[PDB]
Amino acid sequence: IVGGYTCGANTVPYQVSLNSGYHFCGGSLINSQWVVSAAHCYKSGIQVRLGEDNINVVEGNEQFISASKSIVHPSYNSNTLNNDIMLIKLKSAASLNSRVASISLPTSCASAGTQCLISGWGNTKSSGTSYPDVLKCLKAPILSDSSCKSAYPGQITSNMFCAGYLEGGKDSCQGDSGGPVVCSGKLQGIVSWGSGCAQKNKPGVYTKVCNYVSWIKQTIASN
Numbered sequence: 001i002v003g004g005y006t007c008g009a010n011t012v013p014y015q016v017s018l019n020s021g022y023h024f025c026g027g028s029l030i031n032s033q034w035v036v037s038a039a040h041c042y043k044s045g046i047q048v049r050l051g052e053d054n055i056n057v058v059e060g061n062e063q064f065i066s067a068s069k070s071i072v073h074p075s076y077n078s079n080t081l082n083n084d085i086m087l088i089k090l091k092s093a094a095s096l097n098s099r100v101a102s103i104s105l106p107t108s109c110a111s112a113g114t115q116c117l118i119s120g121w122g123n124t125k126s127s128g129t130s131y132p133d134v135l136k137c138l139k140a141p142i143l144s145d146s147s148c149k150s151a152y153p154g155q156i157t158s159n160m161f162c163a164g165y166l167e168g169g170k171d172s173c174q175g176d177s178g179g180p181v182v183c184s185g186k187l188q189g190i191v192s193w194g195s196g197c198a199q200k201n202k203p204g205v206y207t208k209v210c211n212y213v214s215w216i217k218q219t220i221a222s223n
């Protein structure tokens with residue numbers, strides 16, 4: 001997260017870290033057994049880490065649970081990042097408490113102009129590289145579809161939306177991938193892609209979760 005703020009320990013209790021020997025992506029806990037992340041975060045041997053603040057120190061509130069299965073969206077296209085969404089099932093149910101909690105799926109899509117909360121342990125520099133220890137947060141508005149398409153001509157599908165600041169300086173970044181964009185208490189987006197981070201006229205592009213609720217519900221009901 002570039003140009004954000006320190007969230008505060010366990011204030012984003014649905015935020016997870018995906019670990020394959022190291023943190024590589026974020027995700028969102030949607031019930032005691034399932035995590036929503038980006039399909040571009042797919043790999044084998046995922047351990048889900050819940051209740052994290054400092055990802056490099058065991059602070060006492062963590063739950064580390066191995067993934068039993070990963071389900072990439074059937075229409076995910078890794079070239080265009082269309083349908084950039086994946087479900088991860090935990091080997092055992094998480095214990096839900098104040099520090100580990102699920103985030104609601106949306107019933108309707110979010111509105112242009114709505115300020116959303118984006119979070120992760122990704123790069124905090126727009127140029128250069130610095131990774132934080134503690135969870136970072138950013139408040140950013142959903143942009144109009146026309147401004148989103150103008151920013152990325154020929155690349156924005158109906159399964160994507162832009163959020164952030166066209167002046168640059170504030171954005172999600174590498175290492176935030178798969179993490180939550182929460183708007184009005186619902187998981188509305190997943191950190192997906194963008195040209196660089198926090199660049200002028202290049203806002204963040206996010207998977208449009210409201211398009212996937214049917215697929216999510218059907219998949220969780222059968223796996």
Ligand SMILES: N=C(N)c1ccc(/C=N/OCC(=O)O)cc1
Binds near residue numbers: 024173176177196198
């Ligand atoms: N909001 C952005 N500008 C943005 C969002 C997501 C990415 C994803 N990079 O994937 C590789 C990785 O996370 O290691 C890049 C830039």
Ligand SMILES: [Ca+2]
Binds near residue numbers: 055056
């Ligand atoms: Ca920790």
